[PDB]
Amino acid sequence: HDPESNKKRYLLKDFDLEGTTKRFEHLLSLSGLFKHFIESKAAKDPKFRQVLDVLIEFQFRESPAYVNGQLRPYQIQGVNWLVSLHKNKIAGILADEMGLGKTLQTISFLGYLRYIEKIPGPFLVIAPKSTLNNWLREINRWTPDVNAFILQGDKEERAELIQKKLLGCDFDVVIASYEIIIREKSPLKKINWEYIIIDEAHRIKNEESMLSQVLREFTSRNRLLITGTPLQNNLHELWALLNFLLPDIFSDAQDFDDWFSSESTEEDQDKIVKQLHTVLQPFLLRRIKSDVETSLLPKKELNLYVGMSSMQKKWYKKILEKLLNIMMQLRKCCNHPYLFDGAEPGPPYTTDEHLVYNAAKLQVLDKLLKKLKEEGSRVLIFSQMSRLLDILEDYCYFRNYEYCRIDGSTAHEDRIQAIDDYNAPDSKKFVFLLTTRAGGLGINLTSADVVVLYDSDWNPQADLQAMDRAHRIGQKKQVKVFRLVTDNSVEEKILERATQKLRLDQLVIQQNRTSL
Amino acid sequence: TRKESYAIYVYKVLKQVHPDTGISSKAMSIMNSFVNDVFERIAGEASRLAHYNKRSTITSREIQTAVRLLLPGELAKHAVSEGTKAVTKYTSA
Amino acid sequence: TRKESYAIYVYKVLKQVHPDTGISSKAMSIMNSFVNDVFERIAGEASRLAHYNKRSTITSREIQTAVRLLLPGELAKHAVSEGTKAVTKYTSA
Amino acid sequence: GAKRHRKVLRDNIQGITKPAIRRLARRGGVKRISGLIYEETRGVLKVFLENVIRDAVTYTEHAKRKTVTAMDVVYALKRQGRTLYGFG
Amino acid sequence: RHRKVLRDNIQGITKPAIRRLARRGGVKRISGLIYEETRGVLKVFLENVIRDAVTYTEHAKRKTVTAMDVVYALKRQGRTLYGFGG
Amino acid sequence: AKAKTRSSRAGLQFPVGRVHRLLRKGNYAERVGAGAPVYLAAVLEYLTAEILELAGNAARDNKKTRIIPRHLQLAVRNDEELNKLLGRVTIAQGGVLPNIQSVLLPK
Amino acid sequence: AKAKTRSSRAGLQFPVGRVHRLLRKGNYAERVGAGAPVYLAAVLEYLTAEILELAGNAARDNKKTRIIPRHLQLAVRNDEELNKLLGRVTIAQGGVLPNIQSVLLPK
Amino acid sequence: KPHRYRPGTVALREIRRYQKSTELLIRKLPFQRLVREIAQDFKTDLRFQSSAVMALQEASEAYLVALFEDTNLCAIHAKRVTIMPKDIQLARRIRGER
Amino acid sequence: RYRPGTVALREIRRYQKSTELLIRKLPFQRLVREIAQDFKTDLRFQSSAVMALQEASEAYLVALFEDTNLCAIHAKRVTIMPKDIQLARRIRGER
DNA sequence: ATCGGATGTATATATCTGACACGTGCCTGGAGACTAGGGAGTAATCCCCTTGGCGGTTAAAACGCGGGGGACAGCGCGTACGTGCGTTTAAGCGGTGCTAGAGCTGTCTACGACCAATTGAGCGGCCTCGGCACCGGGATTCTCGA
DNA sequence: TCGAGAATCCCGGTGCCGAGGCCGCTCAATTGGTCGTAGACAGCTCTAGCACCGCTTAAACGCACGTACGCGCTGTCCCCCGCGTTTTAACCGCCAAGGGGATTACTCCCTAGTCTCCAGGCACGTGTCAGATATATACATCCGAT
Numbered sequence A: 001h002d003p004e005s006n007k008k009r010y011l012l013k014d015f016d017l018e019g020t021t022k023r024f025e026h027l028l029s030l031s032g033l034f035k036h037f038i039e040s041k042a043a044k045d046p047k048f049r050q051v052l053d054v055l056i057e058f059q060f061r062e063s064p065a066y067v068n069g070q071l072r073p074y075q076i077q078g079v080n081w082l083v084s085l086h087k088n089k090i091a092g093i094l095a096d097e098m099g100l101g102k103t104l105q106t107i108s109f110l111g112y113l114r115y116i117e118k119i120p121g122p123f124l125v126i127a128p129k130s131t132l133n134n135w136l137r138e139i140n141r142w143t144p145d146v147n148a149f150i151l152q153g154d155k156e157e158r159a160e161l162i163q164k165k166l167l168g169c170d171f172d173v174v175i176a177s178y179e180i181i182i183r184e185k186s187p188l189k190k191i192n193w194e195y196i197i198i199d200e201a202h203r204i205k206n207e208e209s210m211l212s213q214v215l216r217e218f219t220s221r222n223r224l225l226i227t228g229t230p231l232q233n234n235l236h237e238l239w240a241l242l243n244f245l246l247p248d249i250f251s252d253a254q255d256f257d258d259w260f261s262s263e264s265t266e267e268d269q270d271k272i273v274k275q276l277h278t279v280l281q282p283f284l285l286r287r288i289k290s291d292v293e294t295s296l297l298p299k300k301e302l303n304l305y306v307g308m309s310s311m312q313k314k315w316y317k318k319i320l321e322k323l324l325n326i327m328m329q330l331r332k333c334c335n336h337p338y339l340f341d342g343a344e345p346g347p348p349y350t351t352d353e354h355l356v357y358n359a360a361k362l363q364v365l366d367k368l369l370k371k372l373k374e375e376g377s378r379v380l381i382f383s384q385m386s387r388l389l390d391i392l393e394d395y396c397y398f399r400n401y402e403y404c405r406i407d408g409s410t411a412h413e414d415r416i417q418a419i420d421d422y423n424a425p426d427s428k429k430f431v432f433l434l435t436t437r438a439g440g441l442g443i444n445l446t447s448a449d450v451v452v453l454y455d456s457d458w459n460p461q462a463d464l465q466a467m468d469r470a471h472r473i474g475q476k477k478q479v480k481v482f483r484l485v486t487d488n489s490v491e492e493k494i495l496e497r498a499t500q501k502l503r504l505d506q507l508v509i510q511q512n513r514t515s516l
Numbered sequence B, C: 001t002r003k004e005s006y007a008i009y010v011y012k013v014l015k016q017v018h019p020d021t022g023i024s025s026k027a028m029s030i031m032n033s034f035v036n037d038v039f040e041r042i043a044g045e046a047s048r049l050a051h052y053n054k055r056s057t058i059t060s061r062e063i064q065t066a067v068r069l070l071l072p073g074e075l076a077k078h079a080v081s082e083g084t085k086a087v088t089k090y091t092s093a
Numbered sequence D: 001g002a003k004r005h006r007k008v009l010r011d012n013i014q015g016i017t018k019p020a021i022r023r024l025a026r027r028g029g030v031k032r033i034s035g036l037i038y039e040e041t042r043g044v045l046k047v048f049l050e051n052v053i054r055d056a057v058t059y060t061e062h063a064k065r066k067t068v069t070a071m072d073v074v075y076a077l078k079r080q081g082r083t084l085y086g087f088g
Numbered sequence E: 001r002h003r004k005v006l007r008d009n010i011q012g013i014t015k016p017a018i019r020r021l022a023r024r025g026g027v028k029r030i031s032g033l034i035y036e037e038t039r040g041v042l043k044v045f046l047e048n049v050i051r052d053a054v055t056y057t058e059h060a061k062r063k064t065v066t067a068m069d070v071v072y073a074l075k076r077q078g079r080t081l082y083g084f085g086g
Numbered sequence F, G: 001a002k003a004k005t006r007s008s009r010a011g012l013q014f015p016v017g018r019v020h021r022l023l024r025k026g027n028y029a030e031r032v033g034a035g036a037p038v039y040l041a042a043v044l045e046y047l048t049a050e051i052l053e054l055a056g057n058a059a060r061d062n063k064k065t066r067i068i069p070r071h072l073q074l075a076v077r078n079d080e081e082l083n084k085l086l087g088r089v090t091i092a093q094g095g096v097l098p099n100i101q102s103v104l105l106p107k
Numbered sequence H: 001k002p003h004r005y006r007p008g009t010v011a012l013r014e015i016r017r018y019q020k021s022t023e024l025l026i027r028k029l030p031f032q033r034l035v036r037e038i039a040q041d042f043k044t045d046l047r048f049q050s051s052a053v054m055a056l057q058e059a060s061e062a063y064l065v066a067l068f069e070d071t072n073l074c075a076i077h078a079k080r081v082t083i084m085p086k087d088i089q090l091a092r093r094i095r096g097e098r
Numbered sequence I: 001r002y003r004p005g006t007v008a009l010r011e012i013r014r015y016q017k018s019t020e021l022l023i024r025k026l027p028f029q030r031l032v033r034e035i036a037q038d039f040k041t042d043l044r045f046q047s048s049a050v051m052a053l054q055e056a057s058e059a060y061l062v063a064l065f066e067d068t069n070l071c072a073i074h075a076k077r078v079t080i081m082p083k084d085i086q087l088a089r090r091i092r093g094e095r
Numbered sequence J: 001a002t003c004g005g006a007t008g009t010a011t012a013t014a015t016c017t018g019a020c021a022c023g024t025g026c027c028t029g030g031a032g033a034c035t036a037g038g039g040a041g042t043a044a045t046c047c048c049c050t051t052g053g054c055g056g057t058t059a060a061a062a063c064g065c066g067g068g069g070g071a072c073a074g075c076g077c078g079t080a081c082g083t084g085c086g087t088t089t090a091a092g093c094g095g096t097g098c099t100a101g102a103g104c105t106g107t108c109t110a111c112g113a114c115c116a117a118t119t120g121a122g123c124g125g126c127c128t129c130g131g132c133a134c135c136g137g138g139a140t141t142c143t144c145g146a
Numbered sequence K: 001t002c003g004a005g006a007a008t009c010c011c012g013g014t015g016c017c018g019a020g021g022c023c024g025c026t027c028a029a030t031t032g033g034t035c036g037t038a039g040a041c042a043g044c045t046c047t048a049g050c051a052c053c054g055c056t057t058a059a060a061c062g063c064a065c066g067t068a069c070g071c072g073c074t075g076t077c078c079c080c081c082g083c084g085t086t087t088t089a090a091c092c093g094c095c096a097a098g099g100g101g102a103t104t105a106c107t108c109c110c111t112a113g114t115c116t117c118c119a120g121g122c123a124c125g126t127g128t129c130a131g132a133t134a135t136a137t138a139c140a141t142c143c144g145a146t
Ligand SMILES: Nc1ncnc2c1ncn2[C@@H]1O[C@H](COP(=O)(O)OP(=O)(O)O)[C@@H](O)[C@H]1O
Pocket: A069, A070, A071, A072, A075, A097, A098, A099, A100, A101, A102, A103, A104, A134
């Protein structure tokens, strides 16, 4: 409790079978395939076979009394699932959709840990830099009686905070960004870390990441991950998530890969995914976004199969035949020919109609913006290239519409000002330029209703997150996705690969939450 | 006895680039030493190149590269043109 | 993929001059380059020296004259003495 | 408008910053530096770099490769008479 | 040979000769202290070149220093000379 | 079975057989290709003609018929490519280019 | 019989056999003698021992037990004849000798 | 009034702190960009290695330091302490480069 | 009576146009074969060898005096002083 | 601003001497078979490159300003050079004699090339634990304005 | 001028990564034997290097005189350094997918080397003659004093 007294519990003044035995005892109650990993890394790893060879219910009905305000019943179910997860010496992944509310559930579960079994910290929380304040606010609001600091600033400020509170053990939560964890590990490697919580666990995918390696060096009683969408593209990434969760069990990537992904059985189908549902049922929890929400109506996603232009065809053939050193050149040409140097006609440059018809997509694009403009709609172009987004900006100038652009080079204050002015009440702002993988999740463009994915991405999750900039809670009229695809080109290839990835994700995970 | 020299050939070139002038003995000795020095420089560069590339033979490609590496600019390109012309004429005969 | 170098030999030489003293990788590479360069200089000078006298063999006499030509001043007589000592010991054993 | 003509990317020779020339000058051991030194330095640097790179590219062209190597750079320096120890 | 070995022949490189060398170099006005410096630098240059030439001629087991040995010594020092063979 | 020289076949003046023998006996490589002597002889002949034309022009400017080391030196030092090629070379009985610094001349 | 390396038979540390093979493969002459590799190995050993002794002295002066390119450079440039031998050589990750002209010092 | 160092006493301190370190004094990425720009004027469609660029940078900085030393001697010979482009031109012309 | 500088310029123009050797032959030969006796006793010299030595020496000295003159000009003088020769040799790398 | 001298600069004429053409031998380059091994062509393969975009830290880099000291110019002056004239002296030349010792030829033998078997030395792969880099903090030293 | 105030050196503590052993294997040294053939040694020879010696006469030496130039001193700007904001770009960490150069491993052909002859091109020795000095002489032109 007292800083000096709590120093005796925080700092680390000093084959963990002690919890491993109970872990396996509870885990083998399910299907026997769970022990296949250990029967593999027992011949592979003899030291871990010493536990296999030998071999409280708190439903927590109502919303926590110790927290402020009322807590939603589905969040009650989630936090009870976290409680059950704790009282089994196992760790899981909460995977509710963005905006459903996960920070509240996590901090309510921490309040459980602190006020029902009396362990006031330490707790490490890792999140993207933009979210830290939005964590501290809920920390102070829902359970006010707790101390926490953001551990931010220049070297001097962070060192002062470390000396004042970290080594002095004057905290309960030590919320810190992804970069801070790497920056200061030695001062932070020894707090014994009851839990380590990672919001937006999409970052921890590659096992060779510096963040991954650093996090493996930490010593913690138990872990936890928060992430809206696990398994973006591959299955090995989900394996990496699970491996970080429980390295005792998921210590064999090749096993899981050859099990489903690296080798899909030559049977008809679905036996292996039934076994996957059995395996991951106790580990990962996810709920349908539309399970309790009504409100947001579903999106009217459409494809506009545009052709090609004469100059576009010429350039595309010139690229196909064989200064340019990638297949992405095809994606540039299929996108807009002006990206190349010399395509623009003449050292004198103009802005008249000589660009609209020269680009295949932008013709139908202009038609659709017009048709919506005499209908009272706003546009959220999400191209994949900032350089091309300049071309679209020039075109919008020619048509005399209103910019509001946030690329990756837009300063944070400029970003928030643009969000404010566009999302403001009635204003002269027709189109909203934006690059898909920009801004993180701190954008709430709920005023508009029409989004046009100008290009397509390799993984569908990026597009889905981009489409959530207008389909989140809030906007309650209509959503019209208008992704543009050009036929007989590499764009068809990337669309097909994205579709197969989305189907894989659907079958693997999007059948669990139906049972959940 | 019978010391070889490039005189008889330097004279043949001279009485086609200026078929009216002559050349003194000291000048001819200087020309001979110049030809020998350039030969040694080019051949040494070519041998070093062949040794670098693990090759066991010296051929027109190494000779051309050594020329292009030792002569400056216009001399290099003109000498390369002359060498390739001579090699093609030799092979087509 | 084998790649030879004088690393073990330079290390053996170091361990008898400064018995308790290591050497980093970059210094090792620099010493290897130094040995290769000195070998190339001496061998090239010996080759030229044998060519001037119309000999076909490189022998200890050419090597000694080459080290006298290349090494500076007082650094040359110690190398010559070491070479003669080694040659006599080898030819007597 | 007309943003499709983005920038100039002023000059990679101007990428050699005045503090960098000043640091090299300090290592050389000079006390006061005139204001016009920073252009002569860039000129001589560019001349030297082209002279070395021409021979390095010649070597890598002869070898029928497409990647200039540290060995090619070392050979070019040796040819110019600037032997470099430490790269092979 | 045994011909009454002499000294101070560096004084044979006389002041007017040094002045003529300076004039061919393009020097208009000459300070009076330059002659000893010139004698020193000439003596150093000659010592180096003659050392190399004598090394060559002694390796060839000869007793006569030849223009070819001198040319080889100059080329070894990096001052290639045209007009005496080679 | 009449014998005609490789120089005649290649249309050169310099000897190709002698260059081949020098390359073989000079301890440059284990083997010597067939086109290397032709290429090297052509290059040598080109360089000789290039320097010797300039020498003849200098001799004509000096109103002389036979060229001398002074004319050779004048040609080499006046032509910049040749001056860079023969930078570290001294020519016997050559001399210097007429050159006086502007500061030394009277006002 | 029993093999005995030529290095051991000559009382050296450097590889006499490897030196002999490099001398035969380097296109230096048609034949190589028997004592030439021994002489060359002895010379190389002497030079490397000298430079390493100076470098170790420098490293011990800097209170360190590894020789680094800084110590190699500092040992080479502080010896007049070694520096003359390596006048045109540059040592990577080396440096310069601490040297400030006396005119530049404060009055 | 805050204390101030007299002109030159910080230049001397920088001199003796830079004649004692060993690292490279030019930034890495700008030098790499300059190298690629120069190289793409002899034959297009080449690539370099990190070790090649490091060796080239090492040789380059050695060249410029060795040039600045002779520039300093020329400036001192001219009864000065400030190095000027005249000094670089003289040092390069005497050295034989140009 | 001419004024200081006129005869010097005339001499510069005269000696930059000639080709012969500016050092007497026997004094230089005596110097050469006195220096030679420090390396081996009872040597003989080819006349061609001595002439090659003389021409190399003269070329070296003229090329040194040109750089010495440039050093003197750089310091706003027209008189060459020993410091100029020392600076030229030091820059050139000989010292 | 014009004269009076001294110094190249053309213009003729005689004199060698050293390029240039011619004849003679022989050594080397060309023609022709024969052969083997170097290098060219094919194909796996695989790791690192490429292009376009993103987010965050944190020093360097760029800029502005004051002010000091250094460069640059001008002035005096007092040597230290240049120029010119006699006076010796030693180089340069022509000639001669002598002998050391470069240079060539013949024999033959010791020693390097080449090849087959054999086997230790050295190189690639792997692992670990000290040497050195980095970070307070305390003491010492050095500069600058009283 | 001594006492701030700043910068640097010198002590402990981490901590981390590369240097330095240890091991297996494979491939170049090593040993023994055979066979040309370079070079080593004797002998000869004839060339050129060395040593005097006399004569001429240009170049070096010594000394005078008198400018002009190198060096020291004094002002005056101006421009470069030291220092405090503030701005940005280098430098990490990432994603997403390719494919393209670089590197073995193998087969086979074709172009080098190696011989044997044998003409003919080039080196050597000789014998002109005309190109380049070697004197003279008149003219142009700078230079320095009027
Ligand atoms: N009393 C409450 N009960 C449930 N949810 C709430 C309550 N008050 C606020 N919330 C919501 O909980 C949400 C937390 O979700 P958010 O901050 O978007 O992060 P995430 O999307 O990761 O869950 C907030 O957006 C907030 O609107």
